[PDB]
Amino acid sequence: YARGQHPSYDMVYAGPMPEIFPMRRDFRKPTRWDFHDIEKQGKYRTSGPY
């Protein structure tokens, strides 16, 4: 390496870092804009999903 004859491994030779073990299902997290009555999302109460 010191005389510059060592075969280079640089960050240029790296492809994508793959997802190997797939995490988990991300279940839908209830937000303030998901409500079965249009009332619970009011203008006087709810200013946004969170």
């Binding site: 991300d26 839908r28 804009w33 998901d34 079965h36 249009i38 999903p49």
Partner: protein, 73 residues
């Protein structure tokens, strides 16, 4: 790569890392009029923000990890 292909990765938020993969469901304030117009006149195209919802006309719904490069469907 060996089966069913890659996931269709979307986000709602600032980045891919800062947001949720989920769109907002049908129960949203702004989606209800639109989804209505879309249920009644099914065949014509409809304006709205109701497009951004997880629910839509096509049999393929938008929810996370849709495999969109899969041969079937």
């Amino acid at each position: 790569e060996l089966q069913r292909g890659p996931k269709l990765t979307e986000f709602v938020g600032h980045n891919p890392r800062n947001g949720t993969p989920w769109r907002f469901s049908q129960n949203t304030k702004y989606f209800r009029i639109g989804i209505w117009r879309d249920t009644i006149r099914r065949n014509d195209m409809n304006e709205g923000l109701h497009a951004h919802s997880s629910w839509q006309k096509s049999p393929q719904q938008s929810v996370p990890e849709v495999r969109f490069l899969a041969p079937y469907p």
